[PDB]
């Protein structure tokens, strides 16, 4: 973990560097390339769907085949993925690059999350999981930030550049990620998180990607004014994801933490819908997302604890279902958004209350031994 973790985090940061990198450059490919808009729906769904199809498989052989190899193969498919996305003018290759892109995130993320769940010690494992989610978020921030930076630099460039780090992380994958030490089956124990992962990510991501739109019309934020609210939640999110390990030293379990994180987020979200002036939605917006930024490691730690082995597969189910939630969620909340502005919040409240219901059922289920 002296150098193994610092390159393992570099693999995961690199993928979300790639996912976020598409956003400021997607609406400039597909017009000068000549695309219609039904394919834009498929273009942004090919990544998610192919991530959904592969992750339960690409990560149930990773246990049997080997963690190191499937990550390294993941990067060489990651490196070639971003190369075809910026090579030349077609659509079937872009539609195939996105599918290959979903292959790379389908064999790395379940494999690497299993790997930093196998080398990390019995304690401080939640800290590494908290450290990872600090980084996947920092991938989501730096990605679109880098893509807007390489603007006058021939906008096919970010994929060459991210392709280059696909090579750089590839050599470091054989060298630095030397073979780990060495080495229930029923799916019934996996039931309660995957619906919990799906239900939240259905509603949580409904608010998240539409937060820049909900506060756009309600309190009328300037475009250089959301950025404070985005970063302020990120900083308190990042600070609390490193404060995250101390909570499990104090808290009795992870499920009890999920309930209180959800109940806390409900209370803040109720303040969020009532308050309609600038400064009492700003200061609230800093602490709206403490419940959400710090539940994603709690969910991820929940997968890695129940799965005594097959931690590639358990991380796979997280990766397939949150990608399902991040795909299904915004589409449904997009229709409900236009009847009245506050609709994604009730989805955020509703799945949060649904999240409280699900965790309470498990608590009395475990009370039944």
């Amino acid at each position: 973990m002296n150098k193994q973790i610092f390159v393992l985090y570099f693999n995961i940061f690199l993928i979300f560097l790639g996912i976020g990198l598409v956003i400021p450059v997607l609406p400039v490919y597909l017009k000068d390339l000549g695309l219609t808009g039904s394919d834009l729906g498929l273009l942004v769904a090919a990544f998610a769907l192919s991530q959904m199809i592969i992750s339960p498989f690409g990560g149930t052989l990773a246990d049997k085949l080997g963690k190191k190899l499937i990550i390294c193969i993941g990067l060489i498919l990651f490196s070639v993925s971003e190369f075809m996305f910026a090579v030349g003018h077609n659509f079937s290759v872009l539609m195939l690059s996105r599918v290959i892109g979903g292959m790379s995130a389908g064999m790395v993320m379940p494999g690497v999350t299993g790997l930093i769940a196998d080398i990390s010690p019995s304690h401080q494992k939640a800290k590494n999981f908290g450290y990872m989610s600090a980084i996947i978020n920092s991938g989501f921030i730096l990605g679109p930030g880098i893509g807007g930076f390489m603007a006058e630099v021939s906008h096919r460039m970010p994929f060459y550049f991210a392709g280059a780090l696909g090579i750089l992380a590839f050599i470091m994958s054989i060298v630095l990620i030397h073979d780990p030490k060495k080495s229930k089956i029923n799916w019934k124990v996996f039931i309660t998180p995957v619906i919990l992962t799906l239900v939240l990510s259905f509603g949580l991501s409904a608010f998240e990607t539409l937060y820049s739109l909900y506060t756009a019309d309600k309190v009328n934020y300037s475009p250089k004014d959301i950025s404070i609210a985005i970063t302020g939640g990120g900083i308190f999110g990042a600070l609390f994801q490193i404060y995250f390990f101390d909570k499990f030293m104090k808290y009795f379990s992870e499920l009890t933490f999920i309930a209180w994180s959800l109940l806390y987020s409900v209370v803040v979200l109720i303040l969020l819908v009532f308050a309609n002036d600038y400064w009492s939605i700003m200061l609230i917006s800093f602490v709206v997302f403490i419940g959400f930024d710090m539940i994603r490691p709690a969910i991820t730690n929940y997968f890695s604890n129940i799965a005594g082995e097959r931690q590639g597969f358990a991380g796979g189910l997280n990766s397939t279902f949150t990608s399902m939630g991040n795909f299904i969620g915004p589409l449904i909340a997009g229709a409900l958004f236009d009847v009245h502005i506050e609709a994604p919040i009730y989805m955020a409240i509703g799945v949060s209350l649904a999240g409280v219901v699900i965790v309470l059922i498990e608590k009395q289920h475990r009370a039944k031994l």
């Epitope: 609406p27 834009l40 942004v44 019309d217 939640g233 991040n326 009847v339």
Partner: antibody, heavy 129, light 109 residues
């Protein structure tokens, strides 16, 4: 991928009730809503109605509110527009557009892309006769 | 030639390959980035730039949706003989939609 064609427009008396019809083949992977953009002869566009596909909720412009009555049927996937009590300032070419608002997760930096993607050919409505 | 969102100039003449900026001042609800439509002389209007995420404005090249102060601007880097039409802003709202009056971009000679 998706083709939507409109039909029903034609001549009418100043006060008669036309009924346009905009059939649509779909599933374009977005959140749909069939608007009814209006273009007068030699003028700019002017949105005049809107139906959401799920939980249908009409929404009319300022000067054509109440006088129109828009509705949709899931069986044939069509967005009627029951005009009522017309006037010489209602002759135009009534396109039927489509709102998509494609989404992409992006943790808080969410990628969302809207716009009226797909349009009909243009059905002409003439009111004074 | 519509109203409720003044956009300037009404009609401009720009030759082949030049760089031209067209802009529209929105209402006092400046958010939900304006989408831009193109309508050739006699067909159904097309759609150039989607409504972006209001963080992604001033995109790299050839067609820029530049979220300026309180007003939105479209800059055309180079004009082919394929891009001569009228351009319309589409500012959304809580439930309704307003279209700009429309600047027609016409060939020079």
């Amino acid at each position: 991928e998706v083709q939507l064609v409109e039909s029903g427009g034609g001549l009418v008396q100043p006060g008669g009730s036309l009924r346009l019809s905009c059939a649509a083949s779909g599933f374009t992977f977005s959140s749909s809503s069939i608007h009814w953009v209006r273009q007068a002869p030699g003028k700019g566009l002017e949105w005049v109605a809107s139906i959401s596909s799920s939980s249908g909720s009409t929404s009319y412009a300022d000067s054509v509110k109440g006088r129109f009555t828009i509705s949709a049927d899931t069986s044939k996937n069509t967005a009627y527009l029951q005009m009522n009590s017309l006037r010489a300032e209602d002759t135009a070419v009534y396109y039927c557009a489509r709102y998509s608002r494609y989404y992409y997760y992006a943790w808080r930096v969410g990628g969302y892309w809207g716009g009226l993607d797909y349009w009909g050919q243009g059905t002409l409505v003439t009111v004074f006769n | 030639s519509d109203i409720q969102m003044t956009q300037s100039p009404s009609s401009l003449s720009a030759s082949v390959g030049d760089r031209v900026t067209i802009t529209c001042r929105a209402s006092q609800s400046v958010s939900s980035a304006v989408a831009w439509y193109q309508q050739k002389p006699g067909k159904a209007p097309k759609l150039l730039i989607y409504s972006a995420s209001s963080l992604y404005s001033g995109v790299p090249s050839r067609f820029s949706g530049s979220r300026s102060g309180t007003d939105f601007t479209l800059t055309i880097s180079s004009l082919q003989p394929e891009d001569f039409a009228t351009y319309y802003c589409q500012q959304s709202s809580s439930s309704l939609i307003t279209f700009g009056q429309g600047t027609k971009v016409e060939i020079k000679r």
